[PDB]
Every structure is written in structure tokens, then in C-alpha cells.
Amino acid sequence: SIKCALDCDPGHDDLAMIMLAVYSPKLDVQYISTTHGNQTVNKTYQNARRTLNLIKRADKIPVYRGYSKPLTRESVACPEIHGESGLGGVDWSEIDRTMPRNPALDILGYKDESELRPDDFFKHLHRLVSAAEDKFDIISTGSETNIAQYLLAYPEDAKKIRMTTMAGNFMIVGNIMPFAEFNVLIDPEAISNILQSGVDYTFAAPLDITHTVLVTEKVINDIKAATEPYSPKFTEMIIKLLFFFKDTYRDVFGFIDPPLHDPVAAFHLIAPEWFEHVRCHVDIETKGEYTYGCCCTNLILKKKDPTKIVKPDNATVCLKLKEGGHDAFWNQMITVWGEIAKEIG
Amino acid sequence: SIKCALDCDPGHDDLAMIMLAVYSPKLDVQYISTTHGNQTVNKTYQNARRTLNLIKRADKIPVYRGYSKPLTRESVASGLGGVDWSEIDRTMPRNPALDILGYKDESELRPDDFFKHLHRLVSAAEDKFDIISTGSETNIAQYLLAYPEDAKKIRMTTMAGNFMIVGNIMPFAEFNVLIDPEAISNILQSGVDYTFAAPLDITHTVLVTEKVINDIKAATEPYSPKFTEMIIKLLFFFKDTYRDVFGFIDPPLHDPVAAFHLIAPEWFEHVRCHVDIETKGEYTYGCCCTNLILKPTKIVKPDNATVCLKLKEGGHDAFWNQMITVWGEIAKEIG
Amino acid sequence: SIKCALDCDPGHDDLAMIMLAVYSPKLDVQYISTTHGNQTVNKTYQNARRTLNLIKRADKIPVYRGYSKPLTRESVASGLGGVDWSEIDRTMPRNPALDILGYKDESELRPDDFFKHLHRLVSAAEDKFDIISTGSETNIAQYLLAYPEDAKKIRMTTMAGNFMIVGNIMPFAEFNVLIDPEAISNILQSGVDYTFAAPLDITHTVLVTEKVINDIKAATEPYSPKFTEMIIKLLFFFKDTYRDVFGFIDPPLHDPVAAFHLIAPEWFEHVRCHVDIETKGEYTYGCCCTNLILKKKPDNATVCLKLKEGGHDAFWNQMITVWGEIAKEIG
Amino acid sequence: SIKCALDCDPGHDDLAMIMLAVYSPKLDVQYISTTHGNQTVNKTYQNARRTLNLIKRADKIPVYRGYSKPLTRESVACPEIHGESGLGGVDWSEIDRTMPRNPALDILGYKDESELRPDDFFKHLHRLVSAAEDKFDIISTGSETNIAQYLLAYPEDAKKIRMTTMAGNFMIVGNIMPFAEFNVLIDPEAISNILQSGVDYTFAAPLDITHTVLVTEKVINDIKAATEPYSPKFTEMIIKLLFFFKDTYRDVFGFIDPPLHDPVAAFHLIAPEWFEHVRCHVDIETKGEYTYGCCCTNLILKKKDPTKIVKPDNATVCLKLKEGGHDAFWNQMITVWGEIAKEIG
């Protein structure tokens, strides 16, 4: 079993990722840290805890509320995709009202949530990094501000951190900006810092991959088949969240079926075998006026003139799923949804 | 018939574009102006004249040798490999441009030579004068700096940029834009009526297949086997690198597509939009940035270009029949 | 008395500033936080504690070791040359910060340690809590990123920048700004009440002349000759490079001037203006850009361009009196 | 006698520079080319010709109308200093009405001025560059766009061009922007191009020097003394122009006596021996948002760590006048004003 932490900004797809990571027996989630991105970090905190409560885990997994804005830029949310709440599609009154105390507070010695501070997670992560036999796994699927901040406070830990991310676009264009992907552009300095720090970094789920991991009619019916027998209430919840995500992806980006981005990065930690991988140098544009967040690589230059590479590698890039990859991913995701529905009843 | 000028950096693609434009009865080429690219503007001059001589037109069309480097950056400089050009070079007629300029020979050619000829054409035009541009766009930027009042009477039709797909020589940008993005940025702000007629979006689907090669042979081999051999080699010179570097099974032909746009616009999708050219980006200069991906109350910066993202149905076939018919007529004249 | 904290990168100048702030009865130093500069934040930690120990205060004031590098750029890293510190190091009392934090020893110090202490001070303040900042301003930028709602209740008084004269380590920019301009840019946008109290504009006219040196000796040599010797060497360590590189006959003392501003603001000219920090410039990052040159976007700082008349003398009498009291305590 | 051309944007101080250069026997002016800057290049054309006509030379010196805007930015004029015309202070009706035909037109084969084109000067300059035994001298005291354009058309001539300029600020702050000087900031890409091209370039008159070359009451009375005996009309003209320049320099920048910048660069070609000189690497800021046009040098680094210098020298910088320099300058300037007044009567 692999001990890991999740850094995320839920967000419908982060919701899916938490489910997979928390319930996969291959992963052992230590905590969740929320960031700014799809919404304000206060909402993404609340949304991680809602995800956990729905899956009967809100009193088991500590959740930390992290940094509210990027290193050197202004926050940019994405209600256009994820609603003003960050998890549109459903009424969360019941989940909010039955929310157990956050075990993070116990760890921190806090009476209540008003004491939560962005750097709360630091000491917990540092214990996990120290304890790790090789490297400690972080899955990051929102802005990567929190990890940048950690590394600024703990630079000596970078070499013992392994990042597995949903971020970027390489061989296809971006989404919220022409050539850049949301998670990078909202704080490119963060990812630029991380790449230079000594972290072992994997672009596990760029749009390149995530734009082929779509929530089709076939997926929706497999979900209902795995869940409706055990928990109609849970079916209703997860379907509505996915339909809301679909509708905005259609109205905003023309997509017929929406991409379920973030679980794919958890899937990479669960089962790396399903992914193509290439080592390269990734530069994050920070100076560009219209192109900040662009992930610019030396892949062309290796292919052209291989033995003249100036810059050393600083990342793994996953451009495609290997054969059977899409199937492997959905079976793992739908099995988790089926187990969740069992626990809920 | 449509009077026009060609600005280009031949270049095998540009060679194909000159052929189409010069031999199309729909177009009336007034001159050709060459620019820098992978090859020095001196070579691209020589290559335009080689193209013209091969097609029995070197003594009809004036060719100008333009600027050797970008507005504010460094160049990245035969330029028509695949072929022995000794015969073409040796039988080269005098460049009619020299007569117009009063020059004894070619060593007197200056980058701004084209200016007064273009200004006469712009003045004479009833609406706008058509320029087809398929290399760096430095020359046109320079012209507009010398003649700002003419921008409003210039219509540009270009091979440049990439919009819904990634770039080529840099991750998100296309060669012609990145080699001088300030040029295109200037032009877009100037009042020029500007059409991205042949971005990679379109040109990456205009590929030299087995079917194209045999149609070429069919149109050319009866009349000029030498010319068949030549045009195939030129089209396949960069084939291996296009495969191993950029994944193509069959290599693209970019620049003719922009001449095709002036010949027959009706084969192209078209959308008016605001294009920003990245100039500040370290790794992303030359990017053509639009909101085309997006389907509020946000201040819309006004349109400054037409973007052609795809060929309409039958467009690829319309293009090749026009291109291959030209190659067929050329091969007739050569024998 | 005015409660305040010092953020600094000692540094001979910062050493002088700590002395003034700690021994002035007008100021009540709550803690010192160290930052990166020409020396690593580990050394600047050690140097703040050395300053405190020398002045018989290392067991009174908590010192925090802060961030080791800028927000988004690379560091440019003893830091108090001129002196043998073996005695001071060996007699160093436990850092009271450790007691506050529950740490056994100094290896457990973390850059964000100061945060909760500062937040208590900000909350407790009736209007705003005073920070004097005289190195890179990374620590304060980090704090504000963790605690954005506190910006409105923080008053900064800094040694940083250059406005009507050129810079020092770069043509148009001053060390403290250029080493992390994103930090100061952040702070200026945050809501902090910010004063450029001691730009080069002022500090380049606060020079260690023969007259200053003899006044120092007069105030100190009667009580502590070894302290006289120490403080002169520290003040003249960088003399040769200040002459050969930057033209000064007598070298400047920058950072005390910012503590002096909190002690006695009335000696300074002041103007409210909009300051833009260059971050995009290749050769000009750290430039503090205003329209101050012109006599014909909302204000975000106070700028102090010159000392009022008698200001130089007010400053030295305060500085030299502190050195005289220190020398008394040392003997 | 030294053959040279003037590139300028008159402008009250350019007016003074033309006077000095044209009437100094040490200099042989081949032509004047006007640029954008203190005003639109059409006005600076008219203003060069007005200068020439006033000094009985409008039919002797060809004037070219050059480029109207910078290489890659939008024009910025300076009416705040120089009036909407570019030469406020005086009524120019008489000068305009008695303006002889521009000899440039004869050189170009043009019937009239509507045929003037920005690249007109090119062929004339190229003949002068070819004919020069070493290098051909250009004095440049406005935007340097025209010379950048020339070099883009004629790159092989750069090595045979010597520039002597009024531009920049090095050890003091700028004027129209905090850290940069008008002539550089209005087109920094131009100067950046020129510095990289192979031109032999001298910053002969930065603000460093020009801010100490002031039009005092002592200068004004010396002017009147040298001119009023021979031409009261000319005295009236040159005084009014200087007083207008003074008043705006006071209202705009608080200067009591205004700096007469541009003549100082002509003075450098007349008598270099009055100037300090240092060779260094000058970088022009082009990327800075608030600091474009800044002249950033490696002078600090040679002083600090001398034998590590990376970047090769690309300019001469004149930081101060040598002793007697200010006197030498005014005697030369006031003698010219005195000779002008003689010819006018």
C-alpha cells in the first residue's frame, strides 16, 4: 500500500479523484490539502470535506485548508465550469449538517475551524517526508501553490518528494487560455519553482490524456449499474454532479462528453503501467503576456538532434495511455463508485 | 483577374505557391519580394528567380530582394534541396526589376526597392491591393512603417500561425510568426485587412499522399519527365524529418494554400476574431492567441483578422486539382 | 513605548539597527526575524543572535530564522566580518523563541515559525502593528500570503529602494528590493501601510565621517574600549569596496535610519504616492518607479526622500547614545 | 573639416544643435534627417527647415523627412516641453512664407514635398558611408528609429558608421520616465538594434552631462551681447525660444534653468577632448514595463570584479565634461549665435 497525500481544488473531477484515491486499497491517503483554483480555498476545503462525508470518511481523513491565492498573481476561479460553490449539481444541506469534526483539528490542537491556517499541513507533511524510505507521494490536481509554499519553507525535502499531477498540455492546445491549462496558468511560478527544486515530478494527466478520458453514455450507465443496486441516493448524487459538469463543458468548450481529468493522476500512482512516459526538460512560461502557464518542452530537440540537449531533464511527461489504459482506468473508477455505494446503502 | 504580389522565402513550399499564383489565370502577379527564413534573403531571392526561370517566367515577373533579418530579433539562417540548379542559374534572364530600378546588376538591389512599386499598386487599387505572404512578414511590416497610410488599402492573405493545434518549430508557435512576431503584431494593429488563410490547422491536413504523387505524375510525366522528377524530389526533400520529428506519414504542403485562398476563397471556413501575437513570452513568442476554444460582460478587444481553421467539404480536392493542373501546364511549357 | 518587530539580514547595518531599536526606550522589540541576503538566512539568524548577545539581550528577545530564498527567484548568497565572534558564540544564551515554540534546539527552527507570534501581535494592536524591515522582504510577503486579512493591520517601515538617485548593486535598483521584487510588489498591493523610510536617497547622506567616528569613541571608549574597537571595525569593514566601487569617501549606514523613522518620524520629509515595482524588466527588476520627477493609479506607499533640517544630527545623537549605553552595559 | 549628417527631432535644443553644427567650421553637414519624438516627424521636418531658413541655409542643406513611429511601439511626443508645434515661443509665419525649395527634392528628383518618403535619406547616406575613409559621422539627438531602419536596409554599413548621440542617463535618474531618458524610451528597440549592429556608438550627451549644461541668466546675457549688435530680430527669436523652453522645464520638472541637451552631442564631434569617456557594455531595457529605455551598464562589475567580465564593450559613455568643458561649450555655441546674427543683420 502506498502512503500519499492529495492536494486539490474540488471541483467535480477532484471529487472523483478523492473517491478513487481514498477507496483504492493500493493507496493510503494521509490527508487532503485544498488550494485555490476551481474556487476560493475556503470552498475547496468545504468541498473536500463534503466529498469525504458523502463517502463515510469525513471523520477519518484530515483535511487542511491551504493558500488562498498564487505566489505572485491574483486568484482566478472557474465557476463557469464548476458553479459558484465549486460542486454544482446537487443540494449539499444534508452532507453539511451531518459533517463530523475534521480530524485535522485533533492533529493541530485546534478547538475549531476558525484556527485553520494555510501552513497547517506543513508539519504533517514533513513528518511523512522524513519517514519515507525513498520519496513521499503527493497527488496534485489543482493549483500547485501549496507545494511551492511548502518547498519554500522546507527546501531540503524537495529531493524526497514525488509529485504526480494533473496539469498542463503539451501536444494539444490549452483550455482556459489558448495554449495553457488552468492548473498551470493560475500559478505558473509555483510549478516553475517546483520543477527547479529537485522534486521528482510527473505530468501524469495533461489534457493530452485527460481529453480522451471522457464521461460518455457508456460510462454513465456503467456507473448506474455499479451503484443503483446498493445506493440510489449515491447514484443520484454522483450522476447529477457528472451531468452538471457535462453541461458546462458543453456550453463553455463545446465538448459533448466532459473529461474527467483529476482521477487520472491518482490512477497513475495506483497503476503507472498504463501510461506512456518520457523524461524531458519542461519550461513553464511566466513572462508571456498571453501564454503564461504554457508547458514548453525540449521533446522536439531530442527527436531532431538528440545529442545536443542543453538543458537537463526535470520532469516525466505522460502524453498517452498505453493500450488498455482507458479501460483499466474506468474499471478502477467504477469499482470504487460501486464500493462507495455499498458502504452508503 | 486579381492583381497581387507574393512575399515569400522559397523554400520548397513557396516554390509551389509561386507556381500556382503565377500560372493561375485567376491571379495577375505584379512582382515577387523575398524575405529571410531558414535561408538568407539572398538565397530566397535566388530561389524565387530559379522558380520563375524553370516555369518560363523569369523574364516577365520582377523579383525584389528584401530584408535580411527581423525587426528586433536575430535571424535563424541552398533552400531548395533535391535538385541540381546549374542549368537554371546559367540560363537565367535579366531580372525585370533591375530595368524598373535603373540598376546595372543585382548587387545594387536594396531591401526597400519594392516600396515604390507596391505604393503605385496600392494607390491604383479600387479597394485593396492583394499581397500573399508565406515567409517571415518583416518586409510588409517595414513597408507599413515607411507607408502607414497604405495599410487601410492592403489585403494580406497569409500562410502563418496555428490556432487550435500546436506549432511546429516551437511548441505553440509556427515558424513564419515566431521568426518575427513583432512584424505580424505591427501588421495586425496597422489597419491591414488580414487573413490567416493557411495556418497549420489547415496545412497539416494538406498532405502529399501516394494519391497526390500519382496525380502529379499523370499530369506531368507525359509532357516533361525531367519536371516530374524535379517536383517530386522538392516535395519529398524534408520527408524523413517531417516523419521522425513531427509524426506525419506524408509531409504537408503549406504555402500554396494561401494562394489558393485568393484564387478560390469559397473552399475555406472563415471567422473574424481578435488575434494577439505573443512578443514578451520567452518560450512562446509567435503564438497566435485568441478565444477560439471558448464558446460574458467581458470587454471584447475588437476583431483584427480573419482566421481560416478548416477547408470546407471538397476543399482538399479543389486545392489539389488546381495545384496539379498548374503543374501540368508548367510541364507542357517546359517539355 | 511602541511595540514592534524587526525583519533584517545582518549584515553590519542591520546590526546597528537592532542596537538602536532594542536599546531605544521609545521602541519595544517583540522579536527579530532574519531573512536571506548576501548571506544565507542561517548566518543572518546567527548574526542577529550575536548582535543581541553582545548587547546583553540574547536572553530577552526571541529570534526567528525565516525564508532562505526569494518567492520566485534564486538567492544571491560570516556576514559580520571585521571581528572575532568566538566569545559571543560560546556564551550565547538559549533563544527564547525555542521556549515559545516547544523546540529542544535550533535545528528545529522553521521559516514560518514567526507567523503565530506576529498574528497575535497584529490582533492585539489597537490600530496597526509596526514591523521594521531592512533586508529582503520575503518573510513579510510569505506572512501576508498565509495571513492576507492582517495586511490592513500591519505598518511597515523599511530600508529599501531608490527614487531620485540611481541604485547600488544594479544600475537603477537597490539590493533589498531587487533580491526579491515580487515580495515588495505583493506587499504594496496587499493593504499594508508602507513607508520607504530610508531609501538610498536618504541613506547615501548618512555617512560615517571622521566626526562620527570620534563621537562614537567619546561615547564608548570610557566604558568599553573593546566595544569601541568592535563597532568601528564593523562600520568600516566594507569601506574599501564602498570607495572603489561606489565612490564614497565615507561609507553609508543604511538600516538604522528605518528604526530612526519609528523612533522619531518628525525628522523626515514624507510624500504619499503610487510605487510600481519592476518585476518584468531584465536589467531593471527591483526599480521603484513613481512620477516623483514630474511636477505636473491610487497611492500605495509613503516615500521619504530627505531628512528635515537637523535630521542628520538627530539621527547620530540617537545612534551614538545607544552605542554609549551598550558600552556601559558591556564594560 | 568633418563631413557628417544630423538626425534630430526639433525641438528647441535640436534647433540649437543644428545652428552649432551647420555654422561650426569644424563640421560639414551633408543633410538633416528628422524623426518622431518631440513631435510628429512632419512637424520636426518643418522645424528643421524653419531652423535652416532663420540661419540663411534652408536652400543649402537637404532635409529628409524620416519615420513617423518607432520600430514596434506607438509614438510619444513631448508638447509638455516643446509645445504642440515642437518649437513654441515664436511666430514662424515669416520663416514659413519665405521658405526656399528643399534641395533634398533636387537630389531625389521630386517635383514637390508630397513625394517625400521616410526612406528617402537612405541612398544619400549610403553614398556618404561608401565614400568615408574610415567611418561616416552621424549626430543623433532624437529617437534613433531612422538609423535603426537604415541599418535594417543596409546592415553591411554599420561597421562604417560612427554615431554621436544625445540619449540616455547612467548615474542619475531619467526625465519623462523615472529611470529613462526620452530619446531612448520612445524607441529602445532602435538603440538596442544599433548597439548590436557593429556601429561605433558614443553616448556623448546623457542627462548626466546635459543636466549640467544649463541656460542661466549669465548665458542669456552673453547671447544678447553676442547677437543684439548685429541682429535684434534674431536676438528676439532665439531668446523667446529659450524662454519658452525654460518655462516648461520649470513647470514640468522644477528646473530653474533648462538644460540645452542636444548641442552637446554636436560639440562632441567638434571637440571630443572636452569629454570624459569610458568603454563599457550597455544593455537597453526593452522588456521592462515601467523601465524600458533604461541604459544599464557593466561599469559596476568592472569596478567590483574586473577580470570576470562576460559581455564585450559596445559603446563609449561620456559621464562628465572635462575641466573647462562647460566654458569651451558655451564659447562655441555663443560664437555661432554671434556669426548667425551677423549673416542675418
Ligand SMILES: OC[C@H]1O[C@H](O)[C@H](O)[C@@H]1O
Ligand atoms: O484543466 C483541468 C483542471 O481544471 C479543471 O477545472 C479541473 O479541476 C482540473 O483539475
Ligand SMILES: OC[C@H]1O[C@H](O)[C@H](O)[C@@H]1O
Ligand atoms: O511553417 C510552415 C512554413 O515554414 C516552412 O519552412 C514553409 O516555408 C512554410 O512557409
Ligand SMILES: OC[C@H]1O[C@H](O)[C@H](O)[C@@H]1O
Ligand atoms: O542596499 C542597502 C542594504 O544592503 C546592505 O547590504 C545593507 O544591509 C542594507 O540593508
Ligand SMILES: OC[C@H]1O[C@H](O)[C@H](O)[C@@H]1O
Ligand atoms: O531627453 C532629452 C531629449 O528630449 C528632449 O526633448 C530634447 O530634445 C533631447 O533631445
Ligand SMILES: [Ca+2]
Ligand atoms: Ca482540480
Ligand SMILES: [Ca+2]
Ligand atoms: Ca515559406
Ligand SMILES: [Ca+2]
Ligand atoms: Ca540589511
Ligand SMILES: [Ca+2]
Ligand atoms: Ca531632440
